Design a protein around this ligand. Structure first.
Ligand SMILES: CCCCCCCCCCCCCCCCCC(=O)OC[C@H](COP(=O)([O-])OCC(O)COP(=O)([O-])OC[C@@H](COC(=O)CCCCCCCCCCCCCCCCC)OC(=O)CCCCCCCCCCCCCCCCC)OC(=O)CCCCCCCCCCCCCCCCC
Ligand code: SF4
Ligand code: SF4
Ligand code: SF4
Ligand code: SF4
Ligand code: FES
Ligand SMILES: [K+]
Ligand SMILES: [Zn+2]
Lengths: 209, 115, 263, 95, 115, 60, 238, 176, 96, 129
């Protein structure tokens, strides 16, 4: 290897992954607004938050996809965008040893039909995505809180919820109970300005408008 | 077509002693639900092509032992599985009908994530 | 209009005649690595870090010096350009004293940042280094002039702006020292601004004097109070204290600098 | 390990397996806690020549992910050549 | 555009309808949680507190957000009917520990410079 | 017949704390992520990070 | 120890020998576990038939790694997606019968025996190479060259102040955890810090199956129903 | 490659059935479970008695912190500040002013001992390896305050644990 | 080399002296205030100064790799002898 | 173009009622939006590309034990990032926050001429290079 430090890239798998791109694009052109392959040979199709079940069910039952292995569903809060939240699923194919990723946009008041019908593995995945992020999922068995304090208010994983929090706990002898109080830190998280001031890698340079 | 497979491996998946005929009738049904779908649909132009090729392929070779690798689909006890839900799959998009153009284009700056 | 058409890595952009290559790529935004040219300051083309090779021509031009010629495609991310930028980079760094943990510019040093983006990952030096004797030019500004890269930014700031007919580059060769020869004081009302223009730790702020580091000072935006100019400044706040005051950019009111009093 | 031979037979017979030669805990076989100084090698790019960072510039070689369709007859293609049946362990068929 | 999507209510009325049934359901257990929680609080106190935080959000005029609130209330009551919530979880609303805070400008001034 | 548990007795910042740390500072998070198998977590995080940088580790 | 760009430090002189001394007697120890904890009549019944998941049910519950392997599913991240140097070592995945508590129990101990060969193959394959990538922009420079070369000092300074900047994008990469499928879906904002690093927790998805996993079993079985799985309360919470 | 772990056909002869019938009736696999327990009883226990003996460690151990100093005697801590930027718990805290001579030594170096995780990162961060982690791990306490360290307590640790870490780093810097 | 305080209150090398009016001294009652007996400020006083006959010397703090980075110091400015900021010790010029 | 029960409500977004922020830290807290000011110690510019949204600083009392800068302001450390200002002000309305926007200053174009450093009578001539 003349370049034993950089990761050697693979193009043959990049081709069929690109080929499977327009494939799923042509099968369901109602929802797939954008299909994108990564330089890490990862496939990412971009769909609409109304036809998630069709596109998810099709990928699950297709004899040419069989992506029955639901890895995880998550959100990436991007407050800049009009649809700040972004529900993202990861699927794996046992027969095709490949992973594809579906990405949708969503706002705070736009429900998503629950993906329990297509991948009922996720029953607990909504229970945290509505917990940490707050995105409600439409027509769901039980959208309950299983990842925060009982009676906690807000959605901590958002970018408006501070890392410090809003509630601090202390045992008081007046009430014989661990009672809540507003947060108050002995020391504060020193915000660090790590981002470099000069231009990084020129590849991902957003053109000015 | 030889000794019946008492243990297919994967638990729960039964071993039907009539794998061939089940495969054909199933493929007729999946070809049936592919009948009403219009010609321009990408579902048809792609999935009937594999179906009749596989339907023609299962019909030609009548022995299970070799047919496992002719269709390559593992064992015969599960090739009817993604096929039967392919029959289901065609039924689901008898409703969604997604060959129409995009429902609406995404917001102008929704994608493209350097920020 | 007179706007001449000149390409930038193929991308066509209209530019004003006389606009330099660095300013030509400014509109789209490239900021070719620079160490001697400053916007509000004259140009010298000394550091040679802005060198970018120009297309279909076997010569590397300075982005700050050669303005334009009709349809000259700037190859910003060229391999030859990266070679030229890398070549001068290990050059000026060769004799730089290993002072980063001890230099106040640590964390906001241009030399540090360039070496990470447009830099190598190793050294090939196997000889000695030069050391320059410090020349105290005030209890308001430091002198670690052994860290000076001879970008001559300071000597211009003396000649222009402040108007003092003062410190220049004495000596030559590897011993080219940027100083005052005789120990002449630097009193000008804009003397404190000589601190930000210096890209290295050669001239740092004596009052600050290693009180904190850039990657921890929560910066706030406030206005100079002492004078009625109402200069825009950035206040450094750490652990509930104020350590140093940095001028902002506002064009008419303060350009890029302030008075010594408010610094 | 230090027990007498007779009791060693007792635990050997009660276990049926050679516990003496493969006794659990450590003994005088471990490497000495004092060790010779090491002389670790150099890296795959510790060359003083023809070694510009651009030739190994693996950080910036990453391109923004490729686009193959955007809103703004060909045969059906499978995303990847499907896996092949694994073979029984030649060392041992079943437990 | 401004033509937003409805979660479950297309207008204030159906959202108001949902507000009624959760709020009406909230005191079917209020005189019983205290009994099961071994609490020292009179039933009236629970009733008015359920009241006062209803006015705490009795200001919005969009059907979706108020709908999210009633299901959030629908996400709250069963957490304490079935003893899932503990004493300190519902005692949190019953603000006793927290230090009394000033309200007027002068009292704000006297305590500290925290505008 | 029905068995749904209630967790969060060890719910922690993890991802929330990660964003305010750098990648190297994020490495200890995975070491403490699960409390049983430590090394294999750093296997995933390092593999993911080196994947993003398109840098392959030395064979040794 | 495992850091981006290779392992942080090198093995001490003699660590390889210590592995062999332990590994030589290890199968002897796991046999001691094997005899009394496997064919024990009351261990067997308390682990056979006590909770089982069929193929498609386990597959659709997000079960992965061993949890599918004990239920008969043929799949393993080690071989199907040979991350790292895994494509140069021979081992056998322990696929099993019906898939009850006992079935995965035999699968797990067999994994240890196979893990012993992966150790042994790797123990006599250690090549004379390096521990870190030779890219100082992502790997801290060697301490000896740190106090001698400026490029090392600057790179060490910036890497230890803000660190390397990762090019933007997202990536979900999973490896075979010794409990299940462990993946991190981190998204890079083109900065020196991550943006969101959701984890695929093997404990999480495998705790998701408990409801169907315990259809019709006694209360005293629930602890064993957990036992056939691996639910570390530190890991389930993402 | 794969290997079945459970599938097995029991032999169905009279001897085989008698074998299995005897196994259930005259408990033999049960007694085997008892059989190798006695082998464990009649074995040396691995019980290290404490503080008399000590489980082995390595010259790389990370424990109680201790700020060292030069052989002439001067503090190694340069206030280079890097240890903070890497400290993933933000336990340490460094603030320095120019000394009487001018050589900057931190006026406050307070490792919040109940904050750090003993990374080794702070050691790997220091360009003059001023802050190290001493081999001591037996420094428990009864008041939460004594855990909260300061500059003086760090220096005392460096002067107390001085020979060991000087030896440990001397025998471990080559790996580093 | 530690001097005393009005309340005894041994003042550290940094100069921290708790004034007699600070309520933050009960922490020290029934206890002891830890100060370092050695003072980094005056440990450089007795360290000998060495005359090296060259324009620029490189200091390493001794110990080869174990020390401080090889920062150079210029032995030309007569005034006060050049001090390596990393090491703290100082090199002298033999006046040629 | 969307048949998911298209109903029209004006209601400039006010998710604040459900965002969970306590009633104290919503109205009194002021919100400030502008682009970074590059530290003049550094000629880099990459900071001045985005819009970040901080809050107003609160009191920082010294911790009597060991001089920590104790803070009870949970929101003192929260800096967002926005591509432009319209989305930035938009985030100020959905989470209804008293905002204070400021338009970003852009480099005025300087006229550059290395030949001007050697003039016939122009003052741009410089006595040193
Ligand atoms: C019941 C079985 C019979 C009595 C015990 C027999 C016995 O210990 O035999 C020695 C020995 C003990 O077990 P081992 O593992 O072989 O000992 C290994 C080392 O020799 C052991 O090496 P060591 O360094 O331990 O040798 C010194 C050891 C030697 O210890 C002995 O020899 C044990 C006898 C007491 C002395 O003595 C001590 O350590 C001093 C402390 C003694 C503590 C108190 C002992 C009380 C014994 C019972 C008192 C009455 C009740 O056993 C045999 O030699 C064969 C098995 C026993 C045969 C008994 C006769 C038939
Ligand atoms: S000026 Fe020199 S010593 Fe200071 S940080 Fe920059 S490169 Fe390091
Ligand atoms: S002292 Fe600073 S500004 Fe002046 S020439 Fe040297 S590096 Fe440039
Ligand atoms: S301990 Fe080391 S890294 Fe930390 S401030 Fe002191 S010199 Fe710098
Ligand atoms: S070893 Fe401890 S004190 Fe040092 S940087 Fe790591 S966590 Fe902080
Ligand atoms: S910027 Fe053109 S050479 Fe300095
Ligand atoms: K400077
Ligand atoms: Zn020195």
């Amino acid at each position: 290897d003349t370049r034993p430090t950089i990761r050697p890239r693979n193009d043959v798998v990049h081709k069929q992954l690109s080929a499977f791109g327009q494939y799923v694009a042509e099968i369901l052109p109602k929802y797939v607004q954008q299909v994108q392959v990564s330089c890490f040979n990862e496939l990412e199709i971009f769909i609409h938050p109304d036809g998630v079940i069709p596109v998810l069910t099709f990928l699950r039952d297709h004899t040419n996809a069989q992506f029955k292995s639901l890895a995880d569903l998550t959100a990436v809060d991007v407050p800049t965008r009009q649809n700040r939240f972004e529900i993202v699923y990861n699927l794996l194919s046992l027969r095709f040893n490949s992973q594809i990723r579906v990405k949708t946009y969503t706002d705070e008041l736009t429900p998503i039909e629950s993906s329990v019908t297509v991948y009922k593995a996720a029953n607990w995945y909504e229970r945290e995505i509505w917990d940490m992020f707050g995105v409600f999922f439409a027509n769901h068995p039980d959208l309950r809180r299983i990842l925060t304090g009982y009676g906690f208010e807000g959605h901590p994983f958002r970018k408006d919820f501070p890392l410090s929090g809003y509630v601090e706990l202390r045992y008081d002898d007046e009430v014989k109970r661990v009672v809540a109080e507003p947060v108050e830190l002995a020391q504060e998280f020193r915000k660090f300005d790590l981002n470099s001031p000069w231009e990084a890698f020129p590849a991902y340079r957003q053109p000015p408008e | 077509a030889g000794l019946l497979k008492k243990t297919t491996g994967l638990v729960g998946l039964a071993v039907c002693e009539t794998p061939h005929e089940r495969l054909k009738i199933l493929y007729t049904k999946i070809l049936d639900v592919l009948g009403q779908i219009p010609k321009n649909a990408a579902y048809r132009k792609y999935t009937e092509q594999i179906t009749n090729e596989k339907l023609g392929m299962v019909k030609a070779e009548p022995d299970v032992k070799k047919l496992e690798e002719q269709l390559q689909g593992g064992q015969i006890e599960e090739v009817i599985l993604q096929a039967e839900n392919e029959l289901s799959l065609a039924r689901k998009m008898l409703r969604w009908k997604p060959w129409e153009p995009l429902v609406e284009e995404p917001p102008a700056n929704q994608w493209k994530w350097p920020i | 209009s007179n706007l001449i058409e000149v390409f930038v890595d193929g991308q066509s952009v209209m530019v004003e005649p006389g606009t330099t290559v660095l300013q030509a790529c400014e509109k789209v935004g490239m900021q070719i690595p620079r160490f001697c040219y400053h916007e509000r300051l004259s140009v010298a083309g000394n550091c040679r870090m802005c060198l970018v090779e120009i297309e279909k021509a076997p010569k590397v031009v300075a982005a700050c010096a050669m303005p334009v010629m009709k349809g000259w495609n700037i190859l910003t991310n060229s391999e030859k350009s990266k070679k030229a930028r890398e070549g001068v980079m290990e050059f000026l760094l060769a004799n730089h004293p290993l002072d980063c943990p001890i230099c106040d510019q640590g964390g906001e040093c241009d030399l540090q940042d360039q070496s990470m983006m447009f830099g190598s990952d190793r050294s090939r030096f196997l000889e000695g280094k030069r050391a320059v004797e410090d020349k105290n030019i005030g209890p308001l500004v430091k002198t670690i002039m052994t860290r000076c890269i001879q970008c001559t930014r300071c000597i211009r700031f003396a000649s222009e702006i402040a108007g003092v007919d003062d410190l220049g580059t004495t000596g030559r060769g590897n011993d080219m020292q940027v100083g005052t020869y005789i120990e002449k004081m630097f009193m000008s009302e804009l003397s404190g601004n000589i601190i930000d223009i210096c890209p290295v730790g050669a001239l740092t702020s004596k009052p600050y004097a290693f009180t904190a580091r850039p990657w921890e000072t929560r910066k706030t935006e406030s206005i100079d109070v002492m004078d009625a100019v109402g200069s825009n400044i950035v206040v450094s706040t750490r652990t509930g204290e104020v350590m140093r005051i940095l001028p902002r950019m506002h064009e008419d009111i303060n350009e890029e600098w302030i008075s010594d009093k408010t610094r | 390990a230090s027990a007498t031979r007779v009791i060693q037979l007792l635990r050997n017979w009660a276990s049926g397996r050679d516990l003496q030669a493969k006794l659990q805990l450590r003994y005088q076989e471990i490497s000495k806690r004092t060790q010779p100084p090491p002389k670790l090698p150099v890296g795959p790019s510790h060359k003083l020549s023809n070694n510009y960072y651009c030739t190994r510039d693996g950080r910036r070689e990453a391109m923004p992910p490729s686009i193959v369709m955007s809103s703004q007859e060909k045969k059906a293609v499978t995303p990847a050549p499907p896996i092949k049946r694994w073979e029984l362990s030649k060392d041992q068929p079943y437990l | 555009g401004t033509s937003v999507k409805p979660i479950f209510s297309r207008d204030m009325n159906e959202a108001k309808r949902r507000v009624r049934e959760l709020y009406r359901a909230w005191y079917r257990e209020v005189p019983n949680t205290v009994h099961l929680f071994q609490l020292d609080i009179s039933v009236k106190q629970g009733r008015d507190k359920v009241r006062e935080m209803f006015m705490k959000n009795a200001h919005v005029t969009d059907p979706r957000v108020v709908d999210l609130l009633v299901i959030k209330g629908k996400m709250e009551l069963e957490e304490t009917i079935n003893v899932w919530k503990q004493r300190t979880h519902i005692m949190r609303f019953f603000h006793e520990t927290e230090a009394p805070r000033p309200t007027d400008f002068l009292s704000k001034f006297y305590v500290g410079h925290d505008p | 017949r029905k068995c749904d548990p209630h967790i969060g007795l060890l719910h922690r910042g993890t991802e929330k704390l990660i964003e305010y740390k750098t990648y190297l500072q994020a490495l200890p998070y995975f070491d403490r992520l699960d409390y049983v198998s430590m090394m294999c977590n750093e296997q995933a995080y390092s593999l993911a990070v080196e994947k993003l940088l398109n840098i392959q580790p030395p064979p040794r | 120890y495992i850091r981006p760009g290779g392992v942080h430090q090198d093995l001490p002189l003699g660590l390889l020998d210590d592995i062999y001394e332990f590994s030589k007697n290890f199968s002897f120890r796991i046999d001691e576990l094997e005899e009394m904890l496997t064919n024990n009549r009351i261990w067997r019944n308390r682990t056979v038939d006590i909770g089982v998941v069929t193929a498609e049910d386990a597959l659709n519950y997000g079960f992965s790694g061993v949890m599918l392997r004990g239920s008969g599913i043929q799949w393993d991240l080690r071989k199907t997606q040979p991350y790292d140097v895994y494509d140069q070592v021979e081992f056998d995945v322990p696929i099993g019968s019906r898939g009850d508590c006992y079935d995965r129990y035999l699968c797990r101990v067999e994994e240890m025996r196979q893990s012993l060969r992966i150790i042994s193959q790797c123990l006599n394959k250690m090549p004379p190479g390096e521990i870190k990538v030779d890219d100082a922009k992502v790997s801290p420079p060697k301490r000896a060259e740190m106090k001698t070369s400026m490029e090392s000092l600057i790179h060490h300074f910036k890497l230890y102040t803000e660190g390397y900047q990762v090019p933007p994008g997202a990536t979900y990469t999973a490896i075979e955890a010794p409990k299940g499928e462990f993946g991190v879906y981190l998204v890079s904002d083109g900065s020196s810090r991550p943006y969101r690093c959701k984890i695929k927790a093997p404990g999480f998805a495998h705790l998701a199956g408990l409801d169907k996993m315990s259809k019709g079993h006694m209360l005293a079985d629930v602890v064993a129903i957990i036992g056939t799985q691996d639910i570390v309360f530190g890991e389930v919470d993402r | 490659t794969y290997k079945f772990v459970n599938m097995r056909e029991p032999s169905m002869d009279m001897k085989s059935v008698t074998d299995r019938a005897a196994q259930t009736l005259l408990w033999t696999e049960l007694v085997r479970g008892l059989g190798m327990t006695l082998s464990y009883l009649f074995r040396e226990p691995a019980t290290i008695n404490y503080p008399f003996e000590k489980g082995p460690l390595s010259p790389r151990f990370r424990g109680e912190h201790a700020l060292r100093r030069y052989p002439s005697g001067e503090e190694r801590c340069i206030a280079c500040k890097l240890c903070e930027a890497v400290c993933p718990a933000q336990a340490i805290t460094i603030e320095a002013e120019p000394r009487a001579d001018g050589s900057r030594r931190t006026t406050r170096y307070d490792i919040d001992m109940t904050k750090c995780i003993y990374c080794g990162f702070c050691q790997e961060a220091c360009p003059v390896d001023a802050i190290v982690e001493g081999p001591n791990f037996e420094f428990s306490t009864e008041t939460h305050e004594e855990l909260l360290y300061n500059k003086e307590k760090l220096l005392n640790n460096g002067d107390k644990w001085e020979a060991e870490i000087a030896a440990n780093i001397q025998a471990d810097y080559l790996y580093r | 080399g530690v001097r005393t305080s009005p309340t005894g209150e041994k003042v550290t090398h940094t100069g921290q002296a708790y004034d007699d009016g600070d309520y933050r001294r009960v922490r020290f009652s029934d206890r002891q205030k830890e100060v370092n007996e050695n003072f980094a400020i005056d440990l450089i006083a007795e360290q000998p100064v060495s005359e090296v006959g060259s324009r620029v010397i490189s200091c390493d703090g001794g110990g080869g790799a174990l020390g401080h980075p090889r920062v150079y110091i210029n032995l030309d400015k007569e005034t006060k002898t050049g001090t390596c900021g990393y090491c703290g010790l100082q090199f002298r010029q033999p006046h040629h | 173009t969307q048949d998911t029960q298209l109903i029209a409500v004006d209601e400039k977004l006010d998710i604040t009622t459900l965002t969970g922020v306590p009633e104290e830290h919503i109205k009194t807290r002021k919100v400030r939006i502008f682009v970074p000011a590059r530290n003049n110690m550094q000629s880099g510019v990459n900071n001045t590309k985005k819009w970040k949204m901080e809050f107003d600083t609160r009191e920082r009392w010294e911790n009597p034990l060991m001089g920590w800068s104790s803070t009870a302001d949970p929101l003192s450390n929260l800096v967002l990032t926005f591509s432009t200002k319209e989305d930035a002000v938009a985030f100020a309305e959905k989470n209804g926050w008293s905002f204070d926007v400021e338009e970003r200053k852009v480099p005025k174009p300087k006229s550059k001429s290395y030949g001007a450093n050697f003039s016939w009578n122009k003052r741009t001539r410089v006595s040193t290079k």
